[PDB]
Amino acid sequence: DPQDVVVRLPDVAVPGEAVQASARQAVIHLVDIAGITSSTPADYATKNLYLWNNETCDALSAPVADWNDVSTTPTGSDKYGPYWVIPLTKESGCINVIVRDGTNKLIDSDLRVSFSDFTDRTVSVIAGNSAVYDSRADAFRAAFGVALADAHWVDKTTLLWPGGENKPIVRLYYSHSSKVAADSNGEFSDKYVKLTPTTVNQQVSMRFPHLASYPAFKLPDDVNVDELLQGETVAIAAESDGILSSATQVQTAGVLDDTYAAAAEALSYGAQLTDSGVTFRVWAPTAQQVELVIYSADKKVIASHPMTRDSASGAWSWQGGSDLKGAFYRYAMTVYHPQSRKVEQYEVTDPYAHSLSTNSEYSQVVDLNDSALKPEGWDGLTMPHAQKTKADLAKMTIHESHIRDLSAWDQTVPAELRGKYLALTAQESNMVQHLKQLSASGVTHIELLPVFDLATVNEFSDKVADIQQPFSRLCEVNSAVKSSEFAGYCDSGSTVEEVLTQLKQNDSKDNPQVQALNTLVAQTDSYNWGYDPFHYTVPEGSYATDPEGTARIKEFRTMIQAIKQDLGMNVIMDVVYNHTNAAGPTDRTSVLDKIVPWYYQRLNETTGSVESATCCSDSAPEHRMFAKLIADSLAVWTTDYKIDGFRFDLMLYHPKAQILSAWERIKALNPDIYFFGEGWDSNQSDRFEIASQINLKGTGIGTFSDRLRDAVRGGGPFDSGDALRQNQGVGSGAGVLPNELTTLSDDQARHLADLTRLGMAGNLADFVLIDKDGAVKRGSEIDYNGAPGGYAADPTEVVNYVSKHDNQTLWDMISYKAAQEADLDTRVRMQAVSLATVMLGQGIAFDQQGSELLRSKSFTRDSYDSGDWFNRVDYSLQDNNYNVGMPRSSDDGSNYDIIARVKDAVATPGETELKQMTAFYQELTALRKSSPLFTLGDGATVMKRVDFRNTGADQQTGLLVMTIDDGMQAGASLDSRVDGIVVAINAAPESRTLQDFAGTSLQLSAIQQAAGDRSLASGVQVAADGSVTLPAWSVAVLELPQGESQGAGLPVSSK
Ligand SMILES: OC[C@H]1O[C@@H]2O[C@H]3[C@H](O)[C@@H](O)[C@@H](O[C@H]4[C@H](O)[C@@H](O)[C@@H](O[C@H]5[C@H](O)[C@@H](O)[C@@H](O[C@H]6[C@H](O)[C@@H](O)[C@@H](O[C@H]7[C@H](O)[C@@H](O)[C@@H](O[C@H]1[C@H](O)[C@H]2O)O[C@@H]7CO)O[C@@H]6CO)O[C@@H]5CO)O[C@@H]4CO)O[C@@H]3CO
Ligand SMILES: [Ca+2]
Ligand SMILES: [Ca+2]
Ligand SMILES: [Ca+2]
Ligand SMILES: [Ca+2]
């Protein structure tokens, strides 16, 4: 346009340095951006430095501590600003400086100038900017150049940007093929669109609430968005004379959704077998070109096809022959990536990949419906356990397992199947037989730690060494071991497992050598929890016997079939849609962010950096096409892999709407699929309504409850040191069997009991009980570290547990917390008493694999990368993996002292204790399914039938007495055999007597009577008058036998 003012840099050269520091000197330039615009011949007399030596930075020579002293004025100055020559006592380390005008700080940040980072000790700064630049040119380019990314192109016509506020010139510059930069004439002569102030519309403010306060700008309706989005876009603002005020990069996810999502959601993606051949489709609305590259089995390029761009959706597609089934392929992208500001060229695997080559290097065309990829009978495989009604869901009893934890140690599993999906088919193995036994006794679901394609195990077996293989192999694959204090074992002739056993003998908090060797092992072994997504909709390859191609698909299904058909359990998958393993245009495992840069990752609103609050590269399920990827992914696991439910990792990083949307999609496929998740720390409520415990009330989406968990275990996940011992739980004798360090009061102990009773009744917001003080409280009125304790509408919305893959095992918590006088048999009963609160409760029951075997990780808190050694589960029942070396020092080193003090209080569990615990455990699961009363499903029904005795300020501490009504006041008789049930958990060292049921015909459950001396209720006495005497550390289930019709039962009181 003729009459538009040209935007340009200031009409002054890029500055050089004023002075360079000499020996025992540092130099600070203050680049006077304001006066570089000239006009006024400036005056730096009042500029001064505040300089002081502390213990972090002490290289100043004669610093002036007096803050009111303003006599450290500039050594000199030129048209670019003043500078200071600062004497030093050395040339190493750093100095502390505050840059002032009088006593006013020009930079609101204690500046740290480190000589390691700036070797010439000559740096530059600008007012209002905490960054330290190595040159005035650098600082100058920062103030008059592209920086940050706080502009947000959020729909077709709306750009949100702070930098544009009340500026005369606001424009969106764009360059197809290069970086927007000032030309040789200092001008920005790239094409642009003009922006005029406007008002944040109502649709945008709902979509982006965290941006609703941004100053809004309008683009004219004529704009050709497709052309701008194919390259770099930079928001630019300038004064009336045209001099640049600021320039920043533009986040485009919002406008991409506004432009393309409606059309793009109507399409299907990936390599899709059709009637006529194969249709390939990938979503890449900013890519300049996409080529489909076809590879031979040997990974030679055998064809390369420019794809067809759909202008309405921004998807690219290509249609080829059906002989491409089984072919390997990648997408060759030409695409601008804002992180590098380069038009990148790279090949990327398919985000909708359903088959992979070894280590996920190539995607592969697959038809998951092929009978060649199914075990025989697959299509008729049925759910062994119903999930239809709320009473169906409440029977869910989950065993959370890991592929290697199941079989890596089991010598009765054929060696080639250890650590593999197919180990579940070894019908005669100890592990499978043990699982069958647990299933027969009432474990109903296996929950699998990540079995989608994880990034953090190398699927090339030549690159991996495991502890069961020779130490020499570990040295071959891990070059760090040569330089390690274990180098002498390379020639030892023994395995790594043998060496680790040998290091046990003199392992201590002073010589943590077991952990030392294991940390090296962990870098190149086959072990990881796998919360590190590479491809969301392909099985992990390292768990297959053959990771090359489609083989893993059939082995995975053969496992799923064996679990459902031979073991009798439903299957839940852990899924991790809240982050990707990596982002950016360079990293091997960046898939999504290479194809559509800055759309699938959640970004910082100012810098454009990929956030890392999840751990890693946070994803954006609030963006429509990632929501679709998630839903499409779950559809494949649901239909093609026959998964019965899904557990979302860090689910509160997801919008409630997206989770509910996803759930409605899957329910249309299979109505009985169960969704649940875990979340505690989402700071994302400013961007959308998060999918949290509170916000999910009533929705039927389940959440892990940390309430009963913390109350029974004691303490919380962030405890360390002595707090691990002091913070006893209900299961470890809080307020009834104190250890030597604790100060738990009786009131504190009773508060834990309130949380536990509340959890056993399903942790409902509206459930009514008598609290620690004898006061009537709603579940939501019980405090939980500030939050409302009860939060659910129905007990199916709550998953109770006392042990999980993350944080310490239950046994290691009891070992930390148990009094010295609690002997080994008592600690085994503490374990069972702890699990009884879960198994006999109204919430869905969840437990870590191996709790029935007193599982220990040698006090490891976070064992995601601690290998076969610390995660071992011995299905030969020799020991519980306790006391096998100090845990990893990087995460548990500040616990070494309390560990050494508590560790050897009693003997390590052996075969006798393991069998007893398993009996206890199967007793509990059998009781859970012995009556519909345990699993009412419905919150209103729980509220009508479940009550508690032994409550209030004078309760007998540690005695939990729950009643479940099946008499006339409750409604119908849900159980033909009983008019009521009493659950009594005596988590205490004293025997206790109940008179609450005196004269009432109460009797002990037949299951526990049949267990005899082996029962958790061994020694329970029911007297003639109906008084019940409970042994120490006991669990008793009692019942009122039903007569010819529904009796009076155990009516809830109207409190
Ligand atoms: O002085 C010991 C001090 O050492 C270190 O502080 C550094 C600090 O990192 C630098 O920023 C700078 O401090 C400057 C301030 O930057 C400057 O603004 C001004 O501070 C004023 C404050 O804004 C104002 O609130 C008030 O300060 C009070 C304060 O409210 C009181 O609580 C008390 O301060 C004490 C601190 O609480 C205490 O932590 C310690 O401070 C350390 C600090 O840990 C460390 O980072 O001691 C002080 C008291 O000795 O009293 C002050 C008022 O006396 O008023 C001041 C205006 O004077 O000035 C300070 C420096 O004077 O440099 C210091 C090192 O000198
Ligand atoms: Ca320099
Ligand atoms: Ca993998
Ligand atoms: Ca590892
Ligand atoms: Ca944030």
Ligand SMILES: [Ca+2]
């Ligand atoms: Ca009944």
